[PDB]
């Protein structure tokens, strides 16, 4: 009966492909060919955050668009004041092999994980002054590649053991475990309503999970290599995935397929980070080629380049008000662009 | 600022601590420990004193060795092997008395992040290798091995097979044979690391 099940899976995949191709009546380019291009987008390094001494692997903005947490393999997580360049917190980590960091939307907590397979939640607003490890969420058997706070109490984490987990920080237990990826889940972005999230794994697929039910609603397989970054469109009805194939692609949740691909002939380095603008018109993608390219998300043409990093840019983030974009890089420098 | 002066003072205070901690961390020699499963990694890491990554740190002749055993990461290296691109050396352990190791060594010595990093190669279980040679010929593993079936020549052939998987001239492979009934592994690591330190210092000055 194994062969029958395999044939049923193959025919179901064929049916999904036929349904997705039936809805592609007109591509995104043939629709947005009539809009004026944004032209050149000249962004200048307004601030440079010179605090880290090793490669920066993660960064995250505060919901107030002023605080930024950064994670470097120096063993530190520094909370930055982007307006004044000041350092408000320097959090020493038990394990220096940190590959992700998150900032709670309330601003009271900071998450951090990496090669220790543990997501550590840090209390920024401790009554006793310093920052203390409120919780160490140890349930993953592989490296934690991403983590995002749903609220002060629950966090969704992505791990290199092909699983995504939803936690309850008060009890430290996996409320839900999302399974179905066949490769290391490398990226994760939560929707604006945080009722569902997408994860990009190394099997060149991105799955649309919903946190409440714990089931993979949709699967988007368009890439050719490992997906390194993922980010929702501001409306929450689309997302962009940047892979090691040196291309980042736009997917539609409702249309269930890709809308545009952002690739250039003179680009061969893979994507490391992808972020959208406040209105979603610009797609800022970080590259291993030491540069960040601004893409016109609708015209699929480069509107600018955020050059000025001496090594691969590992992270990128646009503030909630869209005022600025922060890029961290392997040269231990985080630069605010505007 | 009004009372942002105090915030700036705090920022400077913790920046000074960041600089001090970086200075303190720069003194430690970081070694990445690799090899196949049950290849003698645990034997050498449990004989020189002290669940994702296991860090074993020790001091030998005024050198702090930060040794990372990353064998517990049941995933693909390419997604986290760049975290270790700043290690001084790669300690590779091979079990003689047991092709997978050759493929792993070829992948890790020809990695884009480890072009200049040098590998300190360990060939453990020398005595068990000799006993197995006395019991079974070494031609079983290597079909293209032609030569005497003595311990010395077979062991040298294995070492040459391993040393022939590298191509970058700017790195050396230090091969040592251990019977696991010995405590000279720390000295072997120390002397190889001193050679690597002088080489990297010479490259940093443009003199080499």
């Amino acid at each position, epitope marked *: 009966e194994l062969d029958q099940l395999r044939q049923e899976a193959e025919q179901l995949k064929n049916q999904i492909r036929d349904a997705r191709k039936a809805c592609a009546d007109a591509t995104l380019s043939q629709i947005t060919n009539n809009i004026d291009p944004v032209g050149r987008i000249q962004m200048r390094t307004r601030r440079t955050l010179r605090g880290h001494l090793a490669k920066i692997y993660a960064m995250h903005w505060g919901t107030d668009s*002023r*605080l930024l947490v950064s994670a470097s393999q120096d063993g530190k997580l520094i909370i930055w*004041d982007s307006y*004044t360049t*000041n350092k*408000v*917190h320097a959090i020493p980590l038990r394990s220096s092999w940190v590959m992700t960091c998150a900032y709670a939307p309330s*601003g009271n907590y900071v998450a951090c994980g990496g090669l220790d397979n543990i997501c550590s939640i840090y209390n920024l*607003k401790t*009554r*006793e*002054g*310093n920052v203390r490890v409120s919780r160490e969420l140890a349930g993953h058997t592989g490296y934690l590649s991403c983590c995002r706070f749903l609220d002060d109490n629950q966090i969704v984490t992505s791990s290199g053991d092909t699983t995504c987990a939803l936690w309850d920080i008060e009890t430290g237990q996996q409320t839900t475990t999302f399974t179905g990826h066949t490769g290391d889940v490398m990226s994760l972005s939560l929707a604006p309503d945080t009722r569902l999230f997408v994860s990009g794994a190394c099997d060149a697929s991105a799955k649309l999970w919903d946190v409440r039910e714990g089931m993979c609603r949709q699967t988007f397989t368009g890439h050719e290599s490992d997906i390194n970054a993922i980010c929702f469109f501001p409306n929450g009805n689309a997302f962009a995935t940047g892979s090691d194939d040196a291309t980042c692609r736009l997917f539609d949740l409702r249309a269930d397929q890709e809308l545009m691909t952002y690739s250039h002939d003179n680009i061969i380095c893979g994507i490391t980070s992808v972020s959208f603008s406040k209105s979603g018109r610009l797609l800022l993608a970080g590259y291993d080629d030491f540069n960040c390219n601004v893409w016109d998300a609708l015209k699929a043409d480069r509107a600018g380049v955020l050059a000025g990093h001496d090594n691969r840019v590992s992270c990128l983030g646009v503030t909630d008000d869209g005022m600025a974009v922060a890029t961290g890089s392997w040269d231990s420098f985080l630069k605010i662009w505007n | *600022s*009004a*009372e*942002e*002066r*105090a*915030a700036l*003072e*705090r920022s400077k*205070a913790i920046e000074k601590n960041l600089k001090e901690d970086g200075i303190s961390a720069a003194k430690d020699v970081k070694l990445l420990l690799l090899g196949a499963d049950n290849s003698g990694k645990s034997t050498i890491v449990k004989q020189m004193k002290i669940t994702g990554i296991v860090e074993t740190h020790f001091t030998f002749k005024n050198l702090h060795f930060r040794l990372f055993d990353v064998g517990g990461q049941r995933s693909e290296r390419k997604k986290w092997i760049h975290c270790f691109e700043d290690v001084t050396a790669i300690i590779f352990c091979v079990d003689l008395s047991d092709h997978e190791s050759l493929m792993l060594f070829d992948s890790i010595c020809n990695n884009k992040f480890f072009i200049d990093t040098s590998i300190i190669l360990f060939l453990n279980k020398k005595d068990l290798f000799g006993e197995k040679i006395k019991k079974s010929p070494l031609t079983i593993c290597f079909p293209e091995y032609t030569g005497p079936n003595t311990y010395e020549d077979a062991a040298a052939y294995i070492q040459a097979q391993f040393e022939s998987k590298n191509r970058s001239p700017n790195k050396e492979i230090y091969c040592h044979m251990t019977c696991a009934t010995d405590t000279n592994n720390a000295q072997v690591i120390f002397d190889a690391v001193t050679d690597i330190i002088i080489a990297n210092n010479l490259r940093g000055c443009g003199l080499y």
Partner: single-chain antibody, 231 residues
Framework: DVQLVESGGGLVQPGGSRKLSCSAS????????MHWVRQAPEKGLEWVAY????????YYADTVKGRFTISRKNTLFLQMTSLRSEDTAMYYC??????????????WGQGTTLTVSGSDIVMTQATSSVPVTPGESVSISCRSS???????????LYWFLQRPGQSPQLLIY???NLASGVPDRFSGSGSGTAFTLTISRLEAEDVGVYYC?????????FGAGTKLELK
């Protein structure tokens, strides 16, 4: 628990000297700025001295400079010299960590009664006593000679509540932010120079004297203190 216990207060002959310790426990003392705030038996609060984290910057009041010395075993010191007759007061120990979004002056010490035998920002609370009943809304007011709003947008007005027989508790910091643990019934508002602290659904635990303090520049200046009494 966070605790600031001070000792070293008692009868001192005029012209003498006395040192006051401030033993801290339950918090990271090294990273906090420390203040000495004195209160005369019949008057309101009066900022005395401040020593920053790491002993970087030390500030003294106009009538304290030269005579006193603040230094910081998790303890802070106030080495007084040439104690006049006006130096008799209760001396409080205050922790005032400073970063972006921090809440300075959020914890005050118990206090020690020490009975001894020009261009500053003047902040005036015009009303000194208000009659009020539980369940009603009482609004306290305060003014400042200089605008407390800075170019960064923060207005540095602080509201403290000293309940009868207790140490002051921070209610509102930077003129609009409700401190930690303070009930939501307290609200702060103002515009540049004139500020208003609004209390809704007044309870019996909110009876006391309220101070307005500016943190725009040193010396920090306290208001006279609007005393709210029950019935």
């Amino acid at each position: 628990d966070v605790q600031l216990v001070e000792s070293g207060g008692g009868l001192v002959q005029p012209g003498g000297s006395r040192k006051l310790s401030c033993s801290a426990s339950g918090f990271a003392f090294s990273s906090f700025g420390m203040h000495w705030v004195r209160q005369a038996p019949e008057k309101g609060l009066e900022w005395v001295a401040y020593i920053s984290s790491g002993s970087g910057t030390i500030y003294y009041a106009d009538t304290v400079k030269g005579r006193f010395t603040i230094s910081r075993k998790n303890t802070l010191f106030l080495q007084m010299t040439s104690l006049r007759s006006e130096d008799t007061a209760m001396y409080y120990c205050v922790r005032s960590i400073y970063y972006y979004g921090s809440s300075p002056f959020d914890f005050w010490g118990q206090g020690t009664t020490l009975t001894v035998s020009g261009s500053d920002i003047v902040m005036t609370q015009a009303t000194s006593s208000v009659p009020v009943t539980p369940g009603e809304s009482v609004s306290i007011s305060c003014r400042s000679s200089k605008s407390l709003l800075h170019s960064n947008g923060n207005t540095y007005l602080y509201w403290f509540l000293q309940r009868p027989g207790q140490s002051p508790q921070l209610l509102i910091y930077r003129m609009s932010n409700l401190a930690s643990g303070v009930p939501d019934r307290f609200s702060g508002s103002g515009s540049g120079t004139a500020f208003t602290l609004t209390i809704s659904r007044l309870e019996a635990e909110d009876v006391g004297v309220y101070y307005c303090m500016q943190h725009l520049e040193y010396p920090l200046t306290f208001g006279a203190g609007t005393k709210l009494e029950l019935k």
